[PDB]
Amino acid sequence: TSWLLDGHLRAYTDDLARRLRGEPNAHLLHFADSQVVTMLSSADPDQQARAQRLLAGDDIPPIVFLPINQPNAHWSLLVVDRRNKDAVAAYHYDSMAQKDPQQRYLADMAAYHLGLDYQQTHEMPIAIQSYSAGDHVLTGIEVLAHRVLDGTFDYAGGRDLTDIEPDRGLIRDRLAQA
Secondary structure, eight states: OOOOOHHHHHHHHHHHHHHHHTSSGGEEEEEEEEEEEHHHHOOSHHHHHHHHHHHTTSSSEEEEEEEEEEEEEEEEEEEOOOOOOSOOOOEEEEOOOOOOHHHHHHHHHHHHTOOOOGGGGGOOOOOOOOOOOHHHHHHHHHHHHHHHTHHHHHHHHTOOOOTTOOOHHHHHHHHOOO
């Protein structure tokens, strides 16, 4: 009924990170702040440099969830897995029924500013939204995070999100715990 702001995504991923604390493999995960993602493209050099450090520094974990904001328009999810530095993998999930060139452009610029070859990013299936782009992003992060923890993320098909079922309800419930 309403759309999610950067702050809602941040509050959800903050809470998620707390829920996952101490689990097998949780230290491999980094939930990026969406405003920091936006800043990779900033014209202010020091804004972009900061963003590069926070998301691609020498100590940022190698599996990074990057919410891609099309401001007041749409959300999607870019996942970057750089555990293997000679074979970085990147996955883009867009739930929008009829894709718009802007969204993948924003993901590609993010990949580009992270030092990646944007042409290598896989356009991945995710449940198609039937105002809920945000829900689909949060749900995809949560599902994929649990697959990293339980070690099924690396199986063939382990990054497929075709079958997710986002719900405003449990997101609201998790957001109400703050």
